[PDB]
Amino acid sequence: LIKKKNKDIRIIPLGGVGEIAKNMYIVEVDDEMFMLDAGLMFPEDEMLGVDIVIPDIQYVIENKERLKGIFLTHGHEHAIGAVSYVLEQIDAPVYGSKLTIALVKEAMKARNIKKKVRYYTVNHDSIMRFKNVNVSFFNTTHSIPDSLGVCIHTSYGSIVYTGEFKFDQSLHGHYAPDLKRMAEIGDEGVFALISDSTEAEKPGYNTPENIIEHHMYDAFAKVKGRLIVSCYASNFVRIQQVLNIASQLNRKVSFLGRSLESSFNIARKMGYFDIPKDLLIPINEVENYPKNEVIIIATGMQGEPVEALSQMARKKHKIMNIEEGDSIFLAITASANMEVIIADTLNELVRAGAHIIPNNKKIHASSHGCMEELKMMLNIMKPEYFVPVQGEFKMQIAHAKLAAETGVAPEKIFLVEKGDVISYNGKDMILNEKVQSGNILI
Ligand SMILES: [Mn+2]
């Protein structure tokens, strides 16, 4: 519900536009400022070495007095990766789901930041109140559980930020969408919608996750020897899928040494995963079992999951190496930037004499909605104004075209770069100002 009659609305992207951010979107209602997400970016191609890129928050610092909070949609590193670095320079309350807050806390622990932080755990029923506006939330479907959309209630209508999202008819736990809550927000009136454009260029729909799990099952069932599956640590659904399959094929699961990935292990201890007892075994205990009774999972982030298999195929891995008659499956989705290292690794896999489980080319796997899924969000929301984010310029354009198709006025669709300022007086929406933005390498 709306608290007061508002005057000024400003929307500023400091990350996540013209790039696969590294998400950070600043929303201002009158004298109050809100930051939606704070992601990092891994440097793209170029030269391999440096670890991370974060947004320039100089505009936020100059107006730190007005920052009422930081709102985090999900626990991925493109959403919460730069939070610690923001919290060093500014002190603001952090809002997120139960899992997201846990993952942020771990990030602060890992950087040995002992500074006290005000954490507020939110859910789809939470309604956070401020001087000028009320903020509500709704569940979204993503590769990680407890992802939320943010709804800022103003007199002009709702400012909605989707975060990264999808629409899958097979995911229905803490991955479930809030169709009712979304529909309500739409009917009460959405002033401006800020949505994910990552897969805006791909027509149609994502392949439903259950179809993917089924095809993995049928493929894994044929494996007579050892099986090694490569995954992103970010993709909890794919991880949950192989755990299900291993249980059904009476195999047991082992992660690469020497311990477990932090995000996975936090979510596991909070009960987000469905894991039978003694399904997981330590990597040192793998030799005790016959080759056909183990599934080894290689997880990573930057693109190592592929690199790890290269190190295994080429007898150079510090923990475990590939032996002839081993089976390999890539449970990932390949960026054009990683087409080359997959091709090289596959070759080395074949030279080691490993069986390559082929990826179904009819399958399109993504954490982000395709054209029709994005139009789905647009049809439910029915925004007056649209601001496509989370994509390169070509991706943003594609998302804009989708919006126009759903009935959003072309005049009211805005394509922006980092530092651009979208302002609303009460009559006209204008892009007339530009603030400090950029990339900070770390
Ligand atoms: Mn994500």
For every residue of 296-347, DSSP letters joined together read: EEEEESSSHHHHHHHHHHTT--SS----TT-EEEEES---GGGHHHHHHHHH
d(CA 65, CA 95): 18
Distance 80 CA to ligand 1 centre (A): 10
Annotation: binding site: 74, 76, 142, 164, 364-368
167 CA to middle of ligand 1, Å?
14
Kindly state the DSSP code that residue 413 receives in the 8-state scheme: B
In 3D space, the residue among 254, 244, 329, 324 whose CA is nearest the CA of residue 289 turns out to be 254
Q: What separation in Å is there between the alpha carbon of 164 and the centre of ligand 1?
A: 6
Beta carbons of 16 and 22 less than 8 angstroms apart:
yes
**CA pseudo-torsion sign 388, 391, 396, 400:** negative
Q: How far is the CA of 235 from the centre of ligand 1 (A)?
A: 9
Beta-bridge partner residues of 94: 70, 119
Q: For residue 292, how far is its CA from the centre of ligand 1 (angstroms)?
A: 33
**Ligand 1: centre distance to CA 333 (Å):** 13
Residue 50 CB-density burial (10 A; 0-12 exposed, 13-18 middle, 19+ buried): exposed
Phi/psi at 293 (5° precision): -115, 15
Integer-rounded Cα Rg, in Å, for the chain is 22
Can you say how many angstroms the Cα of residue 219 is from the centroid of all Cα atoms in its chain? 27
Q: Residue ranges for the binding site for Zn(2+)?
A: 74, 76, 142, 164
Instruction: Show binding-site residues for substrate.
Output: 364-368
CA gap 9, 190 in Å, rounded: 13
Cβ–Cβ under 8 Å, residues 349 and 328: yes
Ligand 1 centre to CA of 165 (Å) is 8
Centre of ligand 1 to C-alpha 77, Å, is: 7
CA of 234 to the centre of ligand 1 (A): 7
Q: For domain 209-356, give its CATH number from 3.50.40.10, 3.40.50.720, 3.40.50.10710, 1.20.210.10.
A: 3.40.50.10710
Distance 4 CA to ligand 1 centre (A): 34
Distance 362 CA to ligand 1 centre (A): 23
